[PDB]
Structure 1
């Protein structure tokens, strides 16, 4: 590798071929794995020179080398990305999207993905410079399979970064412009394209219900459910995130997920060996049991109540916390018959065992659930049977001890339970 001093000497030479050789040397330096000297290159003042080289249409090699060098600077910290933006790189890269050389257009796609991925402000600035139309034009072919794999993967990833980040979410008109192409990519047979398409959809459904509706109206829920069942963990993870986001919306949006058959995948998801999959599947279940009584009934019909008993009994604690929410939501909105069924499946003992958790929030959630189950027992006149159940498995000990607990909501609801049923 060259030294930064020699790269500077070559780039300042006013000899195009000397500049090309030095820019290639900079590219190779910035491509090394262990601590590339990004800050040294920035401090040397080379970014504006690299940006000017992006416009040298007669010398496509120096366009490519400078695009690659700038890509790897913009891959770093926000301050390093800002240095690239401050050098004028955004409109220069957008102009390169139209290059007749595929490897150069691809490098501009990559660089814009790094810039837009930095945060909402740079994302929106890339959009304001007009990046979306030429990016989408590169995908305006009747069959995506005619494009090179790596080219298509890079385009999908950059589009996904234009969809990500919040405060603010991406402009509504930009999302509307991107979504039809994103839906095509979501049906494309390549695992990396599918993964990044799912991530993009997961970003667009992470927000207010109006944003969820824009996505659900494009008809993607059945494809998301298909990808929910994929064998590749990098696909299941964003597919599950998107499905989980969608069921945080309206009852009607939640129903599209149920109608598409998503619940049939959850015996596997709720026992998945990856902790984060179990956690986010249980989170998704908790928002489905926050739904209508007919939606709770679909959870019952799919045999998922025993699986909720399972995760409550034994899982990572964060998963158990989501399971507690699923139970409290279920008992808050369920019929008496649905709550009777939950007790019959064995919920009481794992519920009580979690009252030993040194976590104030899960205790409040569990005490709420117990209260909800007692209210169902009152309508059946069987609160005595439930009190014996709670005592037999060691639950009265822990409720009683929770009267002497610090947090106010805890001992309040705790004392209430004992006065009225014990």
Structure 2
């Protein structure tokens, strides 16, 4: 009750008192205002000029409680808008928080970890500034224990979260040397048994692999792919989501990087992913498949072997539209790179009817994508002299009706592709 619901005016009076206990009491009152459920008065606290005082309190080794209260207050200011986070940084908080990482008081060290994560979480500039002030070494030192399970759960979760923010964002991506410095600790966190730590570790990995092939390679070379595939089969959606995100990112890389995903057994999980009740998981999984079918013929063959073509037919037939689009891309990629035999297999699995039904879409690019796939499939039928059987299959399911109509479509490319298909096969 003593420090509950103070006015900002009263907080200022206590902080300007030069009585350390009065200052502590007022800092706690500020912390409570900034910790309330609704609409913390962050701007009012900033406008009152309190940040420089809070920052000074961080350095009071002799009074650990005011260190904690001010770290908490500053954490919450930094949790706000970019302008609010900037106010904290502008007050000199970064080095002050880094100094607290070494505190003998675990709850203070943890609060500093948290504050630094909010700062880094603002964007690449503040992320990189936190790194330049030397945060990585002391952060990693806190996790340098024989067994992570000895750490307090909350403490470990906060450390993992802050590390993930240091891996986050691009333009630019985090410094290469910082990434190399963090990765081994991250790989270790990825093997921990706490669902929250696992989720954030997967998120960190997903950020690191969201980039050019060189960034992907740094992660893949650490040998984490098999563990990612294991997490891909997790029961918890908060783990599956970032695990799948990372796996998808990895397969945007070279064909060799993709093979690592296949070799680790990722494809066996796709029957479940491609029918997952969460729309986003189906979409991400189908996008991922589309990048796998963009690979080598031996990689398309593994998609075939794992029985995934019927699942792609399923998604084309019925799924959220965004997912059906990724499915269309998966098919066009498949038909572009596949062998005649692989392409023929596509038709036998029933690809043609759901492809035709999607020509009723108002999305211009997926019509292009679908028309491309049909061209590709026809090309394969040519080599077999079976073009006629395909033309009929397409007309029987109403596909010819759709294509002919697409000659008076206002997009140039579909105009051409349409007439050309008619001209050649109908």
Q: Normalising by the residue count of structure 2, what TM-score does the alignment of the two structures yield?
A: 0.99
1:13: how far off?
Answer: 0.7
- Separation (CA, whole Å) in 1 of partners of 2:29 and 2:70: 10
Give me the whole-angstrom Cα distance separating, in 2, the residues matched to 1:406 and 1:17.
Answer: 75
Pairwise CA distance, 1:281? 0.3
Note the alpha carbon deviations across 1:323-375, whole angstroms, 9 max, x for none. Answer: 00000000000000000000000000000000000000110000000000000
What displacement does 1:77 show?
A: 0.5
- Aligned match of 1:312: 316
Deviations 1:209-232 (A, max 9, x none): 000000000000000000000000
Separation in structure 2 between the aligned mates of residue 182 and residue 374 of structure 1, nearest angstrom: 48
- Give me the whole-angstrom Cα distance separating, in 2, the residues matched to 1:23 and 1:105: 18
Superposed CA RMSD: 0.4
Matched, 1:361 2:376: no
Q: Could you tell me how far apart the structure 2 residues matched to 1:52 and 1:406 are?
A: 66
Could you tell me how far apart the structure 1 residues matched to 2:376 and 2:37 are?
A: 57
1:390-413 deviation digits (Å, cap 9, x = unpaired): 000000011000000011101111
Once the two structures are superposed, residues 206-262 of structure 1 have per-residue CA deviations (whole angstroms, 9 ceiling, x without a partner) of 000000000000000000000000000000000000000000000000000000000
Alpha-carbon distance between aligned partners in 2 of 1:147 and 1:221, rounded to the nearest angstrom: 26
Q: Return the alpha-carbon distance in structure 2 between the equivalents of residues 33 and 360 of structure 1.
A: 46
Following superposition, the deviation at residue 287 of structure 1 comes to: 0.2
Counterpart of 2:254 (choices 233, 250, 253) is: 250
> d(CA) in 1 for partners of 2:339 and 2:247?
26
d(CA) in 2 for partners of 1:70 and 1:400? 65
Counterpart position of 2:293? 289
**In structure 1, distance between residues paired with 2:225 and 2:171:** 26
User: Using the alignment, how far apart are the partners of 2:193 and 2:267 within structure 1?
Assistant: 24
CA deviation after TM superposition for structure 1 residue 272, in Å = 0.2
Query: Matched residue of 2:383: which SS?
Result: helix
SS at match of 2:45: helix
* Structure 1 runs not aligned, ≥5 long: none
Q: What CA deviation, in whole Å up to 9, does each residue of 1:298-322 have, x standing for no partner?
A: 0000000000000000000000000
Return the alpha-carbon distance in structure 2 between the equivalents of residues 303 and 293 of structure 1: 16
User: Deviation at 1:142?
Assistant: 1.0
CA drift of 1:33 comes to 1.3
Distance in structure 2 (CA, Å) of the matches to 1:271 and 1:316: 11
SS at 2:70's partner residue? helix
* 2:109 paired with 1:105: yes
Q: TM-score, normalised by structure 1?
A: 1.00
CA distance in 2, matches of 1:112, 1:103: 14
Query: Shift of residue 44 of structure 1?
Result: 0.5
Shift of 1:28: 0.3
Gaps of 5+ in 2: none
Listed one character per residue, the Cα deviations across residues 91-149 of structure 1 (whole Å, up to 9, x for unaligned) are 00000000000000000000000000100000000000000000000001111111110
Where 2:174 maps in the other structure, the secondary structure is coil
Between the two proteins, the alignment pairs up a number of residues equal to 422
Q: Deviations over 1:173-217 (max 9, x none)?
A: 000000000000000000000000000000000000000000000
- Matching of residues 140-219 of structure 1 within 5 Å: 140-219=144-223
CA distance in 1, matches of 2:125, 2:134: 15
Q: Structure 2 CA distance, aligned partners of 1:43 and 1:402?
A: 61
SS in 2 for 1:404: coil
Deviations 1:16-74 (A, max 9, x none): 10000000000000001110000000000000100000000000000000000000010
Query: Where does structure 1 differ by over 3 angstroms across 4 or more consecutive aligned residues?
Result: none
